[PDB]
Design a protein around this ligand. Structure first.
Ligand SMILES: [Mg+2]
Lengths: 52, 57, 143, 145, 127, 73, 55
RNA sequence: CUGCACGCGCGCUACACUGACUGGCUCAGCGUGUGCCUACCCUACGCCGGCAGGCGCGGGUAACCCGUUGAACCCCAUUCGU
């Protein structure tokens, strides 16, 4: 409610965020041509630093 | 410097989107605005406008 | 036969080991032991006069089960329920400087040493003789 | 171990200025003295080395006179300093436990102190009002008319 | 001859003024010791300058004229025993004669922020 | 139920030592309303009558200690 | 004016320095997850942030 | 905005022995954590204090660290007895 009047109601918003993970033994040069095959605006992909 | 937690990652680049969707509502109201859509990369990012009358903007 | 500490009633194992550390009079007991109150959520001293021996027996038996605990972890396992008078009750942390001294009282008894990372395990001299009197109190279940 | 009763048993004791019960046990019998509470009693007795499972009328006069001495001045029996009432008192700087009409001596003396210099706490003792910053719109009604 | 009754923590006022700030923390209670372990700030010092100046400019064997202040957070230090401050209650300046027993209180103690209620009669409310 | 006493007189210690092992449900609440003793002697004296051997223990729970008469035949 | 004591009261800790990032309210804001919006602004933009109610 | 001769509304703690103390012994789930403005986050371990707490040394932007979240009730013994 935008004020104090009403009948003590509550709305419950939630946002489920998902996370997955994959290892590779790959060279760090061909990682980009696996990176440049999707546009897919609703994801967030990150590549681990190569020093391991 | 450093980046922040994945919980406050996603509300940040949603409240990014909620902010400029309000501004471009206020600006492009005279042009048949009908929303936006964003793509963020670690490069050149692109905000495509879904305006109808594109000759006015 | 081959009896460990796990297969014995442990509420009376702590009674047995308390008399063990008593009659092996080497446990350095602190001197403020009669004005103590033990972890402020409770309002009297312990009813037993030598409560420090049974608290030594207790923190030995727990540290058999949970290798690598410190003085903060001991205060959590001995803390309890604070009554706030007219306000609702809550959990409370234990008392740090009775848990710290009792872990120091057994490290000078050659029963508990520090680990590579933080915490404390028991030395092999520790687990050899509380398994030894675990079997003796399991035999005292028969004797 | 007291398998019948002994030939002597105090029906009342007479310790500082108050007659205390004989049927309580000493750890809870001497809590009748104002200033010796439920927690202060047990520390006095463990300096006196008395058996705690004993009732009040089953101490001799020698055991009582040692318990009287310890609760009177507890500092030289090595009872520490923040166990006491008058820690760092506002006239002497001494550490003491007060146990008597001396308790209510030093109670009104601090109330009449504030009423002498007219602090805000002293005016709320002069009225019948709540002192430690409570509310008054809804509570404490029968402390007034 | 020249004797009254006084001492405060076992320390009398003639040996409280030649006494450093450090061992006034040790004698004060825990809140005022924390207040003096933390700093005294600029306007807390600018009032004591007027308190020192009013003692010197006072006519001899006569109480000084008032210094008006708003700040009612001041620890009453032994340096201004016998002074005359006027401490603000929100509306007016109440004229408070500092005397050697209030030497551990705030200035807000001695200037009530409300007039104390007296009486009335119930009108339409209370059913 | 009021003015109950502690530390047995002779007139209730000759009465405890004679007839209290006779009956069948001896319990510290029972000797608080039939004997005028108030309990914590009903635990204390009845602990040492089991140490004698005039009665038998049955339960020994922390909330209800139950004794009985001892087998005579 | 007189720059030393114009805005001198310390807006720091406390609800003098918190503000709704949309239109500067200070009442009932949501400081969780770095939203920093108020009670009312959040229900406007909750679909745009990415929060769905239940379905 | 808390001022109190009073009235009323949501609550919290109780009036006890189906308990209260003291000591033992033993099990959780949801979730949250260092910030653009923004100063302040969650904390293990080690040592000082009797407690509140105080310093050292780390870890964690988190199924990685707090944490195998040793939660209370309850359980088992002790004391108290209308
Ligand atoms: Mg009852």
């Amino acid at each position: 409610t935008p004020c104090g009047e009403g009948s003590k109601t509550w709305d419950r918003f939630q946002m489920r965020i998902h996370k997955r993970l994959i290892d590779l033994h790959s060279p760090s040069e061909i990682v980009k041509q696996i990176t440049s095959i999707s546009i897919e605006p609703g994801v967030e992909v990150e590549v681990t630093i190569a020093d391991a | 410097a450093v980046q922040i937690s994945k919980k406050r990652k996603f509300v940040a680049d949603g409240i990014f989107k909620a902010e400029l969707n309000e501004f471009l509502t206020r600006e492009l109201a005279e042009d048949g605005y009908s929303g936006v859509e964003v793509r963020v990369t670690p490069t050149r990012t692109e905000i495509i406008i879904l305006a109808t009358r594109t000759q006015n903007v | 036969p081959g009896v460990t500490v796990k297969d014995v009633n442990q509420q009376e194992f702590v009674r047995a080991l308390a008399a063990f550390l008593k009659k092996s009079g080497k446990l350095k007991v602190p001197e403020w032991v009669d004005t103590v109150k033990l972890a402020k959520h409770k309002e009297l001293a312990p009813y037993d006069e030598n409560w420090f021996y049974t608290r030594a027996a207790s923190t030995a038996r727990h540290l058999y089960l949970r290798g690598g605990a410190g003085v903060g972890s001991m205060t959590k396992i001995y803390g309890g329920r604070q009554r706030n008078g007219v306000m609702p009750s809550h959990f409370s942390r234990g008392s740090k400087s009775v848990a710290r001294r009792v872990l120091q009282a057994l490290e000078g008894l050659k029963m508990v040493e520090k680990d590579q990372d933080g915490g404390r395990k028991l030395t092999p001299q520790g687990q050899r003789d509380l398994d030894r009197i675990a079997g003796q109190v399991a035999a005292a279940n028969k004797k | 171990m007291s398998l019948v009763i002994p030939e002597k048993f105090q029906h009342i004791l007479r310790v500082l200025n108050t007659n205390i019960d004989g049927r309580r046990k000493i750890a809870f019998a001497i809590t009748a003295i104002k200033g010796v509470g439920r927690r202060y009693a047990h520390v006095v007795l463990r300096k006196a080395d008395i058996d705690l499972t004993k009732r009040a009328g089953e101490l001799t006069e020698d055991e009582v006179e040692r318990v009287i001495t310890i609760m009177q001045n507890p500092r030289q029996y090595k009872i520490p300093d923040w166990f006491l009432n008058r820690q760092k008192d506002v006239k002497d700087g001494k550490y003491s436990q007060v146990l008597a009409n001396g308790l209510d001596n030093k109670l009104r003396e601090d109330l009449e102190r504030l009423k002498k210099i007219r602090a805000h706490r002293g005016l709320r003792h002069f009225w019948g009002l709540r002192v430690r910053g409570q509310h008054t719109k809804t509570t404490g009604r029968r402390g007034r008319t | 001859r020249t004797f009254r009754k006084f001492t405060y923590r076992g320390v009398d006022l003639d040996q409280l003024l030649d006494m450093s700030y450090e061992q006034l923390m040790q004698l004060y209670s825990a809140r005022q010791r924390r207040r003096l372990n933390r700093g005294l700030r600029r306007k807390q010092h600018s009032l004591l300058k007027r308190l020192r100046k009013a003692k010197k400019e006072a006519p001899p064997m006569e109480k000084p004229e008032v210094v008006k202040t708003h700040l009612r957070d001041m620890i009453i230090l032994p340096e201004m025993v016998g002074s005359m401050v006027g401490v603000y209650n929100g509306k007016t300046f109440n004229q408070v004669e500092i005397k050697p027993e209030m030497i551990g209180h705030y200035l807000g103690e001695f200037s009530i922020t409300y007039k104390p209620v007296k009486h009335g009669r119930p009108g339409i409310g209370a059913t | 139920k009021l003015n109950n006493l502690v530390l047995f007189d002779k007139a209730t210690y000759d009465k405890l030592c004679k007839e209290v092992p006779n009956y069948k449900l001896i319990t510290p609440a029972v000797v608080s309303e039939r004997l005028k003793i108030r309990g914590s002697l009903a635990r204390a004296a009845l602990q040492e009558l089991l140490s004698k051997g005039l009665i038998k223990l049955v339960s020994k729970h922390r909330a209800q200690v139950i004794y009985t008469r001892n087998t005579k035949g | 004016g007189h720059q030393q004591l114009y805005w001198s009261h310390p807006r720091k800790f406390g609800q003098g320095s918190r503000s709704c990032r949309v239109c500067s309210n200070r009442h009932g804001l949501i400081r969780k997850y770095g939203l920093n919006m108020c009670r009312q602004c959040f229900r406007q933009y909750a679909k745009d942030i990415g929060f769905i109610k239940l379905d």
